[PDB]
Swiss-Prot record, chain A:
Signal peptide: none annotated. Disulfide bonds: none annotated. Belongs to the herpesviridae large structural phosphoprotein family. It is found in: Virion tegument. The chain holds residues 87 to 172 of 858 of the full protein. This is Large structural phosphoprotein. Transmembrane segments: none annotated. Phosphorylated at multiple sites. Homotetramer. Interacts with the major capsid protein. 180 tegument protein pU11 tetramers bind to the virion capsid.
Swiss-Prot record, chain B:
This is Major capsid protein. Belongs to the herpesviridae major capsid protein family. It comes from Human herpesvirus 6B (strain Z29). It comes from the Viruses. Homomultimer. Makes the hexons and eleven out of twelve pentons. Interacts with triplex proteins 1/TRX1 and 2/TRX2; adjacent capsomers are linked together in groups of three by triplexes, heterotrimeric complexes composed of one molecule of TRX1 and two molecules of TRX2. Interacts with scaffold protein; this interaction allows efficient MCP transport to the host nucleus. Interacts with capsid vertex component 2/CVC2. Interacts with the small capsomere-interacting protein/SCP. Coiled coil: none annotated. It is found in: Virion; Host nucleus. Self-assembles to form an icosahedral capsid with a T=16 symmetry, about 200 nm in diameter, and consisting of 150 hexons and 12 pentons (total of 162 capsomers). Hexons form the edges and faces of the capsid and are each composed of six MCP molecules. In contrast, one penton is found at each of the 12 vertices. Eleven of the pentons are MCP pentamers, while the last vertex is occupied by the portal complex.
Length: 86, 48
């Protein structure tokens, strides 16, 4: 599902419109490559565009997403997974 | 006239040992304000 989302959404938006982030599309092609640690490095930089489209005149916002209780519940779920991977 | 005339690095010193050669200021300014490379060189060259 990471490959489906990252393929379908990210490359094709930045190709279909706003043809300046193709360097970042080469970065997300290397993110599609199995270099996950270095890939998830600069998820901030590829989050900033989502911040720009969620709210007009782009600012910096917290890294987890827009809804507050969903934002906290994501972190609760990540701590649950980190405690029990199985 | 046919006089053999000779030139050396010891003769070239008063034009090569000037401080405006060994300044970096103008090279820094010009290479700064020069526009950036393109994307397909930018992936190769401007990455480190």
């Amino acid at each position: 599902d990471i490959t489906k989302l990252q393929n379908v959404v990210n490359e094709y938006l930045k190709s279909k419109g706003l043809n300046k982030g193709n360097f970042e599309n080469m970065f997300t092609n290397k993110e599609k490559f199995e270099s996950q640690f270095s890939d998830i490095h600069r998820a901030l930089l590829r989050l900033g565009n989502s911040i720009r489209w969620g709210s007009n005149v782009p600012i910096d916002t917290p890294y987890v997403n827009l809804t507050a209780e969903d934002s906290s519940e994501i972190e609760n779920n990540l701590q649950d997974a980190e405690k029990n991977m199985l | 006239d046919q006089v053999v005339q000779r030139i050396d690095f010891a003769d070239i010193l008063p034009s090569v040992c000037h401080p405006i050669v060994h300044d970096s200021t103008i090279v820094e300014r010009l290479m700064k304000n020069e526009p950036l490379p393109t994307g397909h060189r930018f992936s190769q060259l401007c990455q480190l």
